[PDB]
Amino acid sequence: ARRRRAEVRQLQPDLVYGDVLVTAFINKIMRDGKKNLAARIFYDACKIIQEKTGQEPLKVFKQAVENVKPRMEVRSRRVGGANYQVPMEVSPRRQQSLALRWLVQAANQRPERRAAVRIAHELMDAAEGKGGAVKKKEDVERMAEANRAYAHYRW
């Protein structure tokens, strides 16, 4: 019954960057608890960003996250055996989490061969507003758009 509001977990800043965000992204890359392979892939992809574009990956990655941020999402709620879906706003914590999660997932959805090039490209596509994650973001906002009827149920 959540007596404690569960305090927000804080991370360690990365190497060379100091991000309070990049490490969170590396973590999503991480599988089976191998931060070595995870971090390497991201920094690898950072080197890949430099090639296809003359931009610093610290902004390319930053803007990509900003473009894959759900303004509002759909929430299933009350009365009628939980029949309604109230479109709710998204907390900065949750926009944060969804952005990075959808990025990595869409990144591994790509037909490319190497994990680094998937990350790099999906970030470049998302920075422009083209990524498959941006599709996911825009999709979730469609659902939230179509439910404005009983949005006044709010909460």
Binding site: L15, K35, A39, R40
Partner: protein
């Protein structure tokens, strides 16, 4: 040549940190602070307390390490480096506390408990 305390421990890892006041930013034990820790991204985070202070290579590192794996050793080194510069510079306390570079971090591997499959992972069931 010289000596400066040194007791860094983190998750079954022991690291004795010295540092000798010389511009040669050096290594210890096996090979380089590189070499011995190459391919390992977070390995260079052990030198962050030096970045927290005014040490751009003013000391000659000498850290003999043992026990655990690399990451714990690296973590322990961080505790030892900080334990040195706080020792021969008692006024460098007002940075090891706000930044929190001084903690043994009691976070250690929890015991396998019977019944459970491993630590906390319950063995999974069906009623039927």
């Amino acid at each position: 040549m010289e000596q400066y305390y040194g007791t860094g421990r983190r998750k079954e890892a022991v690291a004795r940190v010295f540092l000798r006041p010389g511009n040669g930013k050096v290594t210890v034990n096996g090979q380089d602070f590189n070499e011995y820790f190459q391919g390992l991204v977070r390995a260079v985070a052990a030198l962050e307390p030096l970045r927290a202070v005014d040490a751009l290579g003013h000391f000659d590192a000498y850290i003999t390490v043992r026990g655990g794996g690399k990451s714990g050793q690296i973590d322990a080194i961080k505790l030892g480096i900080a334990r040195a510069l706080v020792q021969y510079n008692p006024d460098y306390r007002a940075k090891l506390k706000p930044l929190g570079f001084l903690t043994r971090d009691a976070r250690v591997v929890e015991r396998k408990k019977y019944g459970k499959h491993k630590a906390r992972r319950a063995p999974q069931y069906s009623k039927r």
